Amino acid sequence: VQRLTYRRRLSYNTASNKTRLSRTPGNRIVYLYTKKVGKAPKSACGVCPGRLRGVRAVRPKVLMRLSKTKKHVSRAYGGSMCAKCVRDRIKRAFLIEEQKIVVKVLKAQAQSQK
Template sequence: MVQCLTNHRRLSYNAASNKTRLSRTPGNRIVYLYTKKVGKASKSACGVCPGRRRGAHIVRPNVLTRWSKTRKHLSRACGGSTCAPRVCDRIKDAFLIDEQKVIVKVLKSRAQSQKAKFKNEAFLSNKKVKKRGKKKHLVLGRGVGKVSTKPGGSRISRDGGRQES
């Protein structure tokens, strides 16, 4: 013999709020159980991903009002408002930007050191000493200066002024 099933609520339409499922009781009766609406996970705030946040609890809003803030939010960067792939992208971008800054600093310091080294080499390459008899002629990049080899003699500086030694 087939058991009769009756709706407990007055609403007899197949509405979303009136969904039922069959369940067997401990007394071996079959009854209707009214199922609750399935919730949705909150949308991702990143604006790129079309789906919902992964890792978020899927419950109805009135259940969320009873939960604490730590239970509702995800424990990851950006407060769990952004989806996981976008968080990874942001971390990678931040790392690459920092690496780029470090590379720029290294290149600047390397360029400065090479510039100083080049200046030093250029100065040393312009400095040629020629021996002519007893006097040494010091040839510089800007002009000619004579260096006396006699003790107590005068020396001509680069700018042409005489200096006593």
């Protein structure tokens, strides 16, 4: 039964030195040294425990090769922030900026009776 060796000098089971079983066209099993499991970008908001959508989960120096559209979603804060926390901050941007006008108009109509 096929017992098979490390192919590199690194003779330790470290995160760099990780392999998988690969049957070749020579009808023999040999270690191919696997790439690491990439992570999708986590949200810029900081209340979303899950990772983003529409962005490739890949090791971060590979991102040079990826096309622009593989790295973002087509939206305001695309590939940076989640859809949930954007549209709650479109509300928060608005209802605060409205509340500014509510006290702005009251400011003069709290002054004008004196």
